[PDB]
Amino acid sequence: YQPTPEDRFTFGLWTVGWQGRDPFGDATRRALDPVESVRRLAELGAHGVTFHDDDLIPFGSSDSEREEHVKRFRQALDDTGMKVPMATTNLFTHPVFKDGGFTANDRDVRRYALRKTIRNIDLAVELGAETYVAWGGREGAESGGAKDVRDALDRMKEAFDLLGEYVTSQGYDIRFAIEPKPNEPRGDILLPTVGHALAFIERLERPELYGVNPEVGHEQMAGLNFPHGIAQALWAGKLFHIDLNGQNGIKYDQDLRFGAGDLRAAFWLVDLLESAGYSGPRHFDFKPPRTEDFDGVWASAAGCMRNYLILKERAAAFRADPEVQEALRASRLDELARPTAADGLQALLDDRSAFEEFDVDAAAARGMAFERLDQLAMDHLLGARG
C-alpha cells in the first residue's frame, strides 16, 4: 500500500502545519516552514500541496516580503515536482473577519474581503491551481437578529458573481468550489451542507464555474450520509474537489486522519469515488492530534494515504467478486438502473398491470436480500474473503 504521485493525494499546508492551538490550549508544536512541508510531503509520495494565502504570506506583508515568500516556495515546487492543484483564501482568522468576509454586515469589510480573495486568485493561477476553494467559515450568526439571511445570500451571490466576472475577464482556466460546513466557529454557518451549496450555485450568474468541495467530517457534523451527498454532487456534475478526513459523529470539527471516525462510511465513499471515475485530487483536510510530535505528524499524514489505498483495494474486491455481483442482482440493483416508464406517460396510464392488475401483496412479500449483501461488503472490508 505504497502511495505514488499517480494516486493524486494532496495536503494543505495548514494540515501538517497545524501547531495544535485549540479552544482550550496553546500550541504543542513549532511552526513548519512551508518549504519543509513541501519536501517532506514529496518524500511521503504526495502529489501536491494546497494553501491559504495567509499560510504562505504572513498577514500584513509588503509586496517585497510577499514576493520573497513566493520565490522560495516556487523553488521548492520545482525541485520536487510538487503540484499546487488547489488554493483558497483565509477569510476567517483575522479579527476583521469576525462577522464574516463576503457577508459581514460592514460593507467595507466585504469590499476588503473581495480584494484579498482576488489577489490570491492571481497567485493561485500563476502557480498552477485548477480549483479555487471558498470556505465561508465566518459567514453566519450566533443569534437570530444578527443577520438577515436573505440579504446575506444577496451579498454572497454578489461576491461570487464578481469573482466569476474577474476570472472570465482575465481568461483564467480555474473553477470555484464551495466547501460547506454546518457550524463552528459560527453558531450556524450559511450554506451549511452540500445540498444548500448546490442549490445556491444554481442562482449564480455563471453556474458552470462553481461546484462543491465537500468534507467528510462536515456533512457528518449534521448527521448526514457523506457517500449519499457525494452521489448527489456527482449526479449534478458538481464534484470539483473533495476534502477527506475522519469524524466521530455530531460534535466539534475533529479533522481526524482519513479512515478514522466512521470507517464503513469511508469504505462506501472510496467505492463510490472509484466506481464513478472521480479524477480530481484526493485532498486531506485533517489535523494531526496535538498529542503528537513531528514523528506523529508524518505518521498521521502517511496513514491518510495508507487507509485510502487499503479501502480502494477492498472496494475493488467487493465489486469484482461474482458472489457480490449475484447478490446485487438478488437485491434488484440492476432494475434500479432501468427507466421506470420509458414507454411514456400514456402507456403507463393504460397499463393495467401497473395498478389495476398489480398484485400488491405478492410484491410486498419479496425480500430485498439487503443483509446478505451487506454482510458480503463487511466480509470484504474486513478481509474475511477476497
Place this chain on the structure above:
Amino acid sequence: YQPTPEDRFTFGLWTVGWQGRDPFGDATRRALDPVESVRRLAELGAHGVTFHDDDLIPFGSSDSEREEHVKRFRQALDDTGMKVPMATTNLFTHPVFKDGGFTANDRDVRRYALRKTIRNIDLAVELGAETYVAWGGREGAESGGAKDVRDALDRMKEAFDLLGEYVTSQGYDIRFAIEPKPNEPRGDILLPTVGHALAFIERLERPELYGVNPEVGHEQMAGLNFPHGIAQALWAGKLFHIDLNGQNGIKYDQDLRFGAGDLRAAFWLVDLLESAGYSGPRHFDFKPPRTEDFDGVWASAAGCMRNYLILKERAAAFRADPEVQEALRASRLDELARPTAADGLQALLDDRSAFEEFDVDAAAARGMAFERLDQLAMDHLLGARG
C-alpha cells in the same frame, strides 16, 4: 389570541387522527372519522384540512367505496366552509413500499407508486388543492450497497418529471412541494434537507412547478437552523408550503405541537414568515402525544394556533420597537442590505480605500452590538417590554 380562518391555519387528517401507535406501543386512541375531524377543526377556527389518499379512502377500496368516502367528506367541507389547500400520497405505510415508492429497486413498484400518486392528484385538484406534497419517507437505505444513489436520483427525477408532464397535459393549476427529512423510517432518506431538495429541483424538466414543504422538526433532526433554511427557500422563490411543529434536537421525529421544542427558533421563524409576507397555509404536521385523550388532542391542536398567534404578536412588537430599530442600525443590519460593489469590478479594483488604504485594525475593533440586540429580542419574546 383567538384563531380565525383568516390566519390560514391548516391540519392534516393524520395529525389529530393519530391513534398513538409508536414503535414500542399500541394505539391509545380510537380512529377519528374524517368527517368528525373536519367539523371539530372548523369549530377551533382552522382554515382547512389536508390528507393522504389512504387517510380518506382505506387502502384497497373499490371505486364504489372510494366514491362514497369522497362524498361524505365533500359534504362536511360544504357544511363548514373548510378548504382543502394541500394533499399528498401515502407511499410509505403499506409493506409494498418497504424499499421506497419512486426509487424502489423493483421497477414494478415504482410504476405502481406513480399510478397511485396520479390518481390522488385528480382528487386533490377536484377538491381545490393548490399544493401537492411529496414526502419520500421510504426512499433511502439502511446499508451502503442497497441503493445506488445516482440511479436512485435518476429514478426520482423520472418520477417527478412524469408528474409534471401529467399535470401540465391536464391543465391543472397545482404545484408540487417536496418535504425533506434526513432519516426515519429509513436509516438515511434521499434529499435529506431543504438544501438537497432545492438543488434537486433545479435538475427537473420544469423546475418552476416544484418547491419545498419544509418541516420545523426535520431540519432540526440534522441540527440545522430552520429559520436560515426557510430564508434560503424564500430567497430562491421556492417556499410553496410549510409544516409547523416542535422538536427537541437530534433524535427521533417527535412532531410536537408548534411552539414546543426550540422556542426561540419558533420566534425567529414567525418573525421571518411575517416580515417576508409568506401567504401560504400555516400547516401543522404534528402528533398529539399518545398520553392524551381526545380532550388533549383538541387542546394540543388549539395550542398550535395559539402559540403562532402569540409569537406573531411578540415578533411584530420587536420589529415595531424604536429601540430595536436603533439597535439594528448599531449592528449595521441596514448596511448588509447595501450592494457590496455596485460601482463594479473595475471601480472596486481601483479603490485603494478597499485594500491598500484599508485600516484593517480599526475595522477589527468595531463591536457588532449583537448581544444588546439579542437581549432586546429576548425581552420582547418574554414580554419584559412592549
Place this chain on the structure above:
Amino acid sequence: YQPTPEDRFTFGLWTVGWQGRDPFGDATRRALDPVESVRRLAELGAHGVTFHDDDLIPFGSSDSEREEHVKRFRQALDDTGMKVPMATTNLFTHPVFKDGGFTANDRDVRRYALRKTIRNIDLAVELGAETYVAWGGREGAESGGAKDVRDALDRMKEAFDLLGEYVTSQGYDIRFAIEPKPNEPRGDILLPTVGHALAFIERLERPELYGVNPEVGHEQMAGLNFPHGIAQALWAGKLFHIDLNGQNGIKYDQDLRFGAGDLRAAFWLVDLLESAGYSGPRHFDFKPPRTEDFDGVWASAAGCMRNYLILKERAAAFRADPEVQEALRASRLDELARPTAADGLQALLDDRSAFEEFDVDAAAARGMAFERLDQLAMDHLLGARG
C-alpha cells in the same frame, strides 16, 4: 468463523421475531412461533434465548393458556439444549403503560406494574435465568411539567427495592440489570445513560443485587463512547449483561445487526470485553430490517455472531503483535497502570522533582505516539497485517 454454544451468543425472541411494524409502516413479516425461533436459533449455533413476558404469553391470557404456552416452550428448550440466561418484562407496549410502569403518575398502574414484573420473575427463575433486565422505556416525559423527577426517582427506587425484597425473601439466585436508553419512545427517558443508571443503583437498599445491561446503540444515541462506558461499568463491578447491536449516530434507535453502525467502536468493544474476561452472555438486541424476508432474518442473526467472531480474532492479533506491544510502551500505557503517588501524600508534597524541579517544557515536548499506535490497530482491523 463458525459460532458454537461456547461463544455464549444469545438472542431475544422479540429480535428475530420482529415483524417490522415501525412508526410509519405496517408489519412486513409474519409472527414467528417462539418454539420455531428456539429451534432455528439452535441450528445457527446460538447459546440461548431471552424473552419478555408478553413475547411468550399473549397479554390477557388465563392461567390455563399461560401454562400451555410455557409447556411447549420448555419442550423446545429441552430438545435443543437451549439456555434461557436472561428474562425481562414488557412494561411499555400496552396502552396502560403510556405514562410509565414504575413511575407512572397513576398509583394503581405502578402497583399493577410491580405485580406483572413479580410474576415473570418466578417464571424466569424456574426457567434458569441468571439476570433479570429492566428497560424503563416509558419512564419519562415529553414536557417539563408532566413529571416531577425527584418524586419519580423515589418511585423508581421504591419499585426496585421491592423487587430486591421479593427475590431475597424467595431465595432466588438472580440479579437485576437496568438497561439505559436516553430517549424514544418518551421524549426523555429516566436514567438515560450507563452513568445515570450506575449512580442510581448506589442509592438502592441492596446495591449488590443490581447492575447494568448497556446497549451499543443507546449510548451512541447520546453521542457517547460505548467502550468507555463499558469500561466504567466493569471498573465498578456492574457489567451484569450487555446488548450488542449497531447504530449510525444520533438518531432513532436503529437496532442494526452487530458490526454495522460504528465499526471501529465495535472493534474496541470486543477488545475490551475479551481482554477483561467478561463471561456473561453476548446478547443481541437487534432488529432485522423490515426490508428482509425470513431468509434475511436468519442471515442477519448469523451476521451478528459472525462479526463478533471476526472482531475477536482481529483484536487478539492486535494485542498479540509485538509491534503493538512496543507501540503501547512508546505511548506509556504501561505507566498509566503505575500508581501516581504510592509513596503517599507527604512524600509527594516533599518531592521537589514533582513541581519545583519539574521540567514542564521537556515534558510538554514528548510525543504520545498515539497515531502510530492507532494505525497499527487500523491495520489489524482491516487485516493489512497479522
Place this chain on the structure above:
Amino acid sequence: YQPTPEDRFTFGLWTVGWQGRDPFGDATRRALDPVESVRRLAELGAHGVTFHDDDLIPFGSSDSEREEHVKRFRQALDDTGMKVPMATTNLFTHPVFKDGGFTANDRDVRRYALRKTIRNIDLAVELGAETYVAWGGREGAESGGAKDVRDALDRMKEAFDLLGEYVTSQGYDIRFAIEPKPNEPRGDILLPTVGHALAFIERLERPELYGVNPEVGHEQMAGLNFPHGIAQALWAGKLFHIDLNGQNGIKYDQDLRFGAGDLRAAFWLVDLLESAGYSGPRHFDFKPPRTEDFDGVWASAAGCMRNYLILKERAAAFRADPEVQEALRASRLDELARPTAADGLQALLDDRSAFEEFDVDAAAARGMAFERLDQLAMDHLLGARG
C-alpha cells in the same frame, strides 16, 4: 429585574475575560485585568467571582510575583465586598497537559498535576472558597488504544482520594465538585455526563466530600435533558454548584449567555432550582461572543442575570396559579408523590385489585392531560397570563 448580591450571581474571571481566541481565529479583545473585572462585576450586581489559578497568577510566576498578584486581587475584593465562592485549577491549557492531568499516561505529569492543584486549594481556602471545581477537560482520548479506561479511572480515583486526604488533614472546610463534559477538546472526555460523575463519586474513599458542578451546555452537548439531570443530582444530595449558560444542541461548546440556546429548558431549570431551594451560587460559565466589544461583554454578563430573574418570576407565577395547581392534580402529579406500596410487599402481593381485579382497559383510557398543563406553562413563560 435588577440583580442584587442577594441573588448570588457569580462569574468566572475567564468568562468576561475571554479574549475571543477560537479554533479558527485570533483574539478580538484585549485582556482584562482581574482587578478591573472584580470592580465592573460588582457594579453590575454580581455576588462574587471565581477563578482558575492561571487566570490570576500567570503560569511560571515566582512566589514573589505570585504574592503580588494575590495582593492586588485581595484589595479589590475588600473594596467591593466581592465574595470568592468557588475556585478551580487550570489543568488543560499548557502543552504539558496535552494527554490529561490526573490521567495523563506519563506518571510525572500526574504528580505535577496534583501538586499544582494542591497549591491552588490553599489559596482558594484562604480566599473564602466553599467549593473547589475540577473540570477534567484533557482526561480522555481521540483513539481507542491511547487510554486504558479502567486504569485511567484508577488514576482518577487515586488523584481525588489524595485531594480528599489533603483537605481533611489540613482541616479545610471545602468540598469538591466535578464538572462533567462529554467531549471537546478531547474526542471523548472521561466522566462525560452528570450520571457518570455521580457514579464515580460513589467509589471514592470519602464520597461525602464530592459532588457535581453540572453545566447547562455540556449535558445538552449529549442531547440530554438538563433539568432531569439536575433533579437526579439533587435527589442524590450532590448538587454542590452549577454552571449556567446557553447551548443550541449537539455541537461545539458554545457557552452562550444564560437564557440563550434552549429557552424552555432554562425555564424548567429555574423552576426546579427555586422550588427545590437550591442555595448555592448561580454561576455563569459563559463566553461573550467574539463579535462583541467591551460594551457587549458587560451587556452579555448583565443579560445572564436578567434572564434568570425573568424566568424566576415566570416560574413562580406558574406554580402560584390556581389553574396550574388544578392542572397538576388533573395530571396526577400529586399521586406521583404517594408511595406505591407503603402497605408492603406482602399486602401488595395479596391485593387482587392490583392485578387480578385490575381494570387495565379503564386505566388505559385515562388521559394524562399533559398538553393542557404544558400550554399553561407556555402561557406563563410568554406572559400571556399572570
